[PDB]
């Protein structure tokens, strides 16, 4: 039931200086919202709005470290946060608009080149204030964007102004028709500080005119930018059992609806489970029409305390089922923690739908939590210290080392085992803090990227390959081909041994190949050595019967032939274009290595459990013998890659993104098909690479690192 995993991308992950070398600070006179805006030159740029709407940082996704980042300081906080702010690339320039508190209208103009150039300075006129209206009376809160010259505003009193650009930098108010509905709610019984405040909290734009909106009280309106008159005003709350008692009226502004083609989709307050999707149908003599259709509910259990974070209506993807048409990628939050789901719509008919979910934690994050890492070098403390620094990397590691001093805690001797457990917990923490959701983004066609609060941090949700589903869905399911079951009855045993025990074995297996466990011996004696030494009196005999019997009802010879030759060991890639990347893309770079790692990790576990049976049961070392010698080869290879993963990530990446010579800069994926493709390609280079020391310089290098 889980189809995508979470791959975490810390743009500075590889590097050791927590901050880009080239950082520029412009003035005038993050930890709030962050998102990616694609550009002309096929370059995504990310933005952050300092918590206090004070600062607005900028940087290039594809190259966080060497690339340059800008910290555009501001005269003073905008009106209603990231709402009274919009960013669109006019023409070879970025146009930022920010109705500061004072009611000014700040407009920035940044050259495209000034982002991807070298300049530590920007001169001329890029920023300029203004005051085309007295926002002293009717304060706004939802600055929008329509055209390069026009874009509407929105006041807290269900009102809306307008801004028309005549020249190059000038705007003048253009009211519509509301005034009527405003002046008269005065003559009717009352109009307090917040009585009938159907203020707007969402909006869009269908066919350059229709500002399909929405109000606090779900009243959906549809103005006309060729009339300046509100063409309609639906009452969303009355298109299905209008839950009396308590309808949570939109309090805090937010992304409550998105529109794709003809369709629209809307989140509605019903124990958090209302996605009303009434497709549009606008032309006819009648100029407007919102055709309600269905109202799908969300499976947000655990009390339903999951506020939306952003979401997106869009094309089909490529998942399990065939029945496809649309995908509503939805992203919720809860404290720092978050959930991302893809809501598959089987047919145009809005009633046959199927929900898909994904793992909310990186495989790495998961390993540490449930203490499941068997590869990481243990022992010392300055060692466990080195590790953490790697698994977490500079930025997060330094933030946590500050916080440990700020909170008056320091290291006793160079074995302060308590500093550790501390550093450790702060790290789990600083990381989850940093990884807080904030907005989706479709890198390329349909690739899900989540932007997080703390800059240089993103999270890609990848579509699981076959094995990856079994891994991530072992306990999570029943049924599925034979292999799955086999892999589970194996897991259903290994799980019960201790790690010290697993390590100890994997250890031995490594030897059968390095030779430490002398060749002479029969691949039948070692397996017994590796039994008195590693598994005798190390497991409950009871579970041993389960495995044996359970293991029987399996065509082992087969399931195992499918596992090793159709699941793990790939065949041959007749090179299905990955798009040789010209300039070094650091983003795509780590999305690869992390994803590479996630796979081998799962292979490694599987590989390991399989072999474990070849020692715990007398099976014909001459029948399956073909496999074993292959299994060991794999096991030994996987492990080596894993250990290497930890030793030095940046390095492991260069030798894996230049090994693919023509692509000695990386690849440029645009769809999950291209992604898996690539991954497996490397999955290969690893599995098909020589592991024989052609000299001592090499035997050493191996004995050491491994």
Curated annotation (Swiss-Prot):
Chief location category: nucleus
Keyword Ligase: no
Role according to the record: Functions as a component of the nuclear pore complex (NPC). NPC components, collectively referred to as nucleoporins (NUPs), can play the role of both NPC structural components and of docking or interaction partners for transiently associated nuclear transport factors. NUP120 is involved in nuclear poly(A)+ RNA and pre-ribosome export, in GSP1 nuclear import, in NPC assembly and distribution, as well as in nuclear envelope organization.
UniProt subunit comment: Component of the nuclear pore complex (NPC). NPC constitutes the exclusive means of nucleocytoplasmic transport. NPCs allow the passive diffusion of ions and small molecules and the active, nuclear transport receptor-mediated bidirectional transport of macromolecules such as proteins, RNAs, ribonucleoparticles (RNPs), and ribosomal subunits across the nuclear envelope. Due to its 8-fold rotational symmetry, all subunits are present with 8 copies or multiples thereof.
First and last residues shown, out of full length: 1 to 729 of 1037
Assigned keywords, A-Z: Coiled coil, Membrane, mRNA transport, Nuclear pore complex, Nucleus, Phosphoprotein, Protein transport, Translocation, Transport
Residues bearing PTM Phosphothreonine: 394
Official protein name in the record: Nucleoporin NUP120
BP-aspect Gene Ontology terms: double-strand break repair; mRNA export from nucleus; mRNA export from nucleus in response to heat stress; negative regulation of transcription by RNA polymerase II; nuclear pore localization; nucleocytoplasmic transport; positive regulation of DNA-templated transcription; positive regulation of transcription by RNA polymerase II
Any one annotated GO CC term: nuclear envelope
GO molecular function terms noted in the UniProt entry: identical protein binding; structural constituent of nuclear pore
Residue numbers spanned by region Leucine-zipper 2: 267-288
Subcellular location: Nucleus, Nuclear pore complex; Nucleus membrane
Domain of life of the organism encoding this protein: Eukaryota
This protein's record includes keyword Flavoprotein: no
UniProt region (Leucine-zipper 1), positions on chain: 108-129
Upper lineage: Eukaryota, Fungi, Dikarya, Ascomycota, Saccharomycotina
Membrane topology: Peripheral membrane protein
